[model samples]
Target chain A: RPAFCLEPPYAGPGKARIIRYFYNAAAGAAQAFVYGGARAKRNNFASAADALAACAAA
Target chain B: RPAFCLEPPYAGPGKARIIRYFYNAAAGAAQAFVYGGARAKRNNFASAADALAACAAA
Candidate 1:
C-alpha cells in the first residue's frame, strides 16, 4: 500500500488501495488507478516518471 | 487540452495534450492520459472526482 493508503484521511482494511499503473510510451502517457473509500480515480501525467511519482505521492 | 496542457509549464502546439480520461467503476478507479513535450504522469485520488480534478488542476 502507498503512504496515503496507509495513513490518515484514508486507512485500514481496503480503505484506499492502488490498483495498478501504466507507463505507455507508445501510447504516449502514463496512468495510475486508485480506490479510496468509495471513490475510484485515474490520473495521467506527461511522463512515465511523473506517473510513478504521482502514484507514490498520494 | 486541459488548463495545464494549455497553459504555462506545458503549453503551446504539441507542448502537452490530454489524450483521454477513464472512469471505471468496475476497475474501481478513474485515470487520465496526456502527451506532448511528453512528461507522462499519473495520479491516484480518493475518488473519481479527485482523479478528474487533479488532471484539470495541472
Candidate 2:
C-alpha cells in the first residue's frame, strides 16, 4: 500500500492518530505503526520535534 | 513596537496568545493589540485563515 496516509479523525488532537500503514489489497490485511500523539511527534521527523520529545516522555 | 506579532506562551495551544505592540521609548509605556489564539488565527491574514475563522466562532 501507500507509505503513509493520514487516516480518519483526519485532523484532531487525539492519541493514536494514524499516519501510515502496510496492507494487502486482496485479503485486506494490515499492520500499522501506532503511536500516541506524543510518540508520533518524536517519530514524526517534521515540525515540533522538541514538543514531541516532551510529549513522548510525558 | 512592531504591528501586532506573536508573543508568549511562545509555542503552545493557549487562549491569550500575545502578538505585537506600540510602545513609548522612555518609560516603558505600551499598548497592545491582543487577541486569543483563535481570534489571532482569523486576524493572521496569512496561513490557516479558515482554521482561525472557526476558532473565532468557537
Candidate 3:
C-alpha cells in the first residue's frame, strides 16, 4: 500500500474531481462505494468550521 | 486508459528510472508525445526478450 497521496490544495472542476478520486484510491479505498475516515472526516470538520467561522464574522 | 502498468517485477537504478515515469504517467501516457502503447512500447519491449536471453547447452 502507498504511504502517501499528495494532492494540490486546489484544482479546477473535473480535474479536481479526478485528483480527489486519485487521492482516495491511493489511500487504499479504490473499491469503496462510500467514503468516510479519520483523515476525510477531519477535513470535513475543518471545512465546516472554517465556513461557520466566516459566517459568524460576517 | 489505465488498463495495465504494474512495476516491480523488478526495481533498481535511479529508483527504476523514476518507476518507469510513474508507470507511464499512471497508464494514461500523460503529456506523452511519442511513446507507444499498450502501456508504452518502450517499456513493453524492454521487459520483453527478458533483458538478456540465457544461452542453452549445445
Candidate 4:
C-alpha cells in the first residue's frame, strides 16, 4: 500500500474530487480507474502499489 | 468545506481508483464532474461544497 492509494475523499483549489480506497467500498473495485460512467473498460492494475506509481506520477 | 472533499488517493480490495479536486487542476474545472474522457458534458456547480455533497454522498 502506497498510503496515498487509500486516503479518503478530498479535493483541492482545482476542484477535482479525488477519492481513494484500500478496498472496494462504493465505487465497485479497488485501485481501478472507472472509465467514463458505464463502469466498462476499467483500467485495472496488478497491484495498488503499481497503480499508485502509474497514477498521479505527474 | 467538507474536509473529505480534498484528501488524497487511496484504494482497497476491489481496486476502485478514485481522485477528487476542489478547484481547477489537471482535470480542469473545480468541484466539477468531468464527464466523458474527451472533456465534454462537464457537470459544473455553483459551489465546491455543493459539488462535494452531490458527488460522493454515497
Candidate 5:
C-alpha cells in the first residue's frame, strides 16, 4: 500500500484543503480525498504516483 | 503532498504490518513508516513514488 499527502500553502480566511492519496489494495487502485474545507473531492487513479501527480498539479 | 498505503495480507497470530508512504513538503523529501506488529521502521526517500515503491517492495 502506498500513501501520499499533498498540503498546499495554507491561505488565510478559511482552512486550506489538503489532498491525500492512498493505494487501495482492496479496490486494486489508487484513490484520493481532500480534507479541511467543507467541499472536497474524491478521485481514482491507475497508480499511486499518478494520484500524487494529479494532486500536485491541482 | 502524497500518500500511499501498503497493506499486506493479514496472517494469523499477529497482525500484519502495513507500510505507509508520505511526501513531506516541509522536509522537501519523502518518508515512510510501518504499522501493526511490535517492531516497525521509518525511512526517507527522494520522491513520493520512490517511497511508495520502497514500501511496496518491503
Candidate 6:
C-alpha cells in the first residue's frame, strides 16, 4: 500500500479543496491528487511534499 | 515550451534507454519521460534530477 499525506485546505474553483501526496511503492515515485470537486486530477512529483506544493499552487 | 535534460543511456528491456526530465513552464511543475523501445512513459518529479533518478530505477 502507498502512504499519503494531506495538505491544508485551499481555495478551489467554487469550493475548498486539498492536495494529497502519496508515495507509490510499486513505481517508486511520489504523486499527488487534488480533491474537492467532482473529478480529481492526478499529478507526479519528485518528492511527496513537492506534490502538495504543486497542487496547492494550482 | 518546457525545458528538458536527458540522462545517460541505461538498459531497458531490449534496448538502450534514457530518462528525460522536463520542467513545464505553464504548470510550474517538473516531469519526466522514459524513452525506450516504441513507447515512452511520462512521470512527474519535484526537481529535474529527481525525475531522472526515478526513471533510472525503473
Per residue, candidate 6 scores C-alpha lDDT tens digits across A1-58 of 2123232323245354555444343433344545455333334333343543333221
lDDT per residue as tens, model 2, B1-58: 3322212112235576555332212212232333445533212332333323323231
Q: What's the residue-level lDDT of B25 in candidate 2? A: 20
C-alpha RMSD in Å of predicted model 1 compared with the true structure: 12.9
- For each candidate, report its DockQ versus the true two-chain complex: 0.03, 0.02, 0.01, 0.04, 0.05, 0.05
A-chain TM-score in candidate 3? 0.23
- Residues A1-58, candidate 3, lDDT per residue (tens digit)? 2223233223322312221223233332211112233234211212211212222121
Q: Write the per-residue lDDT of candidate 3 for residues B4-38, one digit (tens) a residue.
A: 23221212222223212222222222111222223
Per-candidate iRMS values, in order, are: 9.6, 20.0, 18.1, 9.1, 10.3, 10.9
Recovered native contacts, candidate 2: 0.00
User: RMSD of each candidate?
Assistant: 12.9, 16.9, 16.6, 15.3, 11.3, 13.4
Report the lDDT tens digits of candidate 5 across residue range B1-58.
2233323222223375555444443444334444455333334332344443444332
Off by over 4 Å in 2: A1-17, A20-58, B1-9, B12-45, B48-58
Candidate 4, residue A49: how far the Cα is off, in Å: 1.5
Ranked candidates, highest DockQ first: 6, 5, 4, 1, 2, 3
List runs of model 4 lying over 4 Å from the truth: A1-39, B1-58
* TM-score on B-chain, cand. 6: 0.31
Among all windows of 10 consecutive residues in model 3 chain B, the one with the lowest summed lDDT is B49-58
Docking class of 4: incorrect
Question: How well docked is model 5, in DockQ terms?
Answer: 0.05
Superior by DockQ: candidate 2 or candidate 3 = 2
Query: Residue-wise lDDT of candidate 1 within B1-40, one digit each (tens)?
Result: 2333222222224665445443333333344444353443
lDDT of each: 0.37, 0.29, 0.24, 0.33, 0.40, 0.39
* TM-score for each predicted model, relative to the true structure: 0.22, 0.16, 0.19, 0.20, 0.25, 0.24
* lDDT, residue B25, candidate 5: 37
The parts of candidate 1 lying over 4 Å away from their true place are A3-58, B1-18, B32-58
